[PDB]
Amino acid sequence: GEELFTGVVPILVELDGDVNGHKFSVRGEGEGDATNGKLTLKFICTTGKLPVPWPTLVTTLVQCFSRYPDHMKRHDFFKSAMPEGYVQERTISFKDDGTYKTRAEVKFEGDTLVNRIELKGIDFKEDGNILGHKLEYNFNSHFVYITADKKKNGIKANFKIRHNVEDGSVQLADHYQQNTPIGDGPVLLPDNHYLSTQSVLSKDPNEKRDHMVLLEFVTAAGITHG
């Protein structure tokens, strides 16, 4: 598993979504450099106009590209599931607003790491921060707490995403995540630890389509050396 990530790996992301009856698709392409924890991707809304704010999709749109330091190699579930990959499911509850539920498969297709997602969102308020497009086009850094689910041969993650709002308030998005290998081969079940994330969101001046340029660094931590 770890051997597949020693260099720069091309990435394809494909998302189909439906939020309050507003359907959309997003296609992302770029590359991942797990050695440095670095993702560079550009996403296009392939159905035209994205009906939700781009930052609310960042977490759904490849934790196998986290940098696990050598003393933590034993705790990298994500890469150990490769190339056959893993299923990633979440419930994302936007405080005072609706919920996303997502199911994704992350695996190699040829030499490309591919994340294919279906997202369903319900119960959003027409005038809330999401359907109202009141979120800033930016992203915060988070503490993503990983724990093993030993009886499901997989992991769980819990974290609270902070989406900055245009009036200076914050929109919270509680994330409940479960990952399960796709194949039958053995995987690593980690001790408790966290993924330390940071992201920046930008635009391509030459892009006429609705899009998002994303740069992201993630490093694993939380286990003492030795």
Please, could you describe this protein's structure?
It contains one helix and eleven strands. The chain starts with 7 loop residues before the first strand and ends in a 5-residue tail after the last strand. The protein has one domain (2-221): Green fluorescent protein (Green Fluorescent Protein). With 226 residues, the protein is an all-beta fold. A hairpin with a 5-residue loop joins strand 8 and strand 9 (170-181). It has an eleven-stranded mixed β-barrel.
The name of the CATH superfamily reads: Green fluorescent protein
Query: Tally the helices: what do you get?
Result: 1
The gyration radius over C-alpha positions equals: 17 Å
Main β sheet profile: 11 strands, mixed, barrel
CATH fold field value: Green Fluorescent Protein
User: How many individual domains?
Assistant: 1
Share of residues in helices: under 10%
The coarse silhouette is globular
What is the CATH C-level name?
A: Mainly Beta
Pfam families: GFP
InterPro entries: GFP, GFP-related, Green_fluorescent_prot
Family: Belongs to the GFP family.
Subunit structure: Monomer.
Short description:
Helix content is 2%, strand content 50%. It has 226 residues and is mainly β. The chain has a single domain (2-221), classed as Green fluorescent protein (Green Fluorescent Protein, Beta Barrel).
Which keywords apply here?
mainly beta; eleven-stranded mixed barrel; 1 helix; globular
List the helices and strands and how they pair.
Blueprint: E1 8-19, E2 22-33, E3 38-45, H1 77-80, E4 86-94, E5 99-109, E6 112-122, E7 143-149, E8 154-164, E9 170-181, E10 193-202, E11 211-221
Parallel strand pairs: 1-6
Antiparallel strand pairs: 1-2, 2-3, 3-11, 4-5, 4-9, 5-6, 7-8, 7-10, 8-9, 10-11
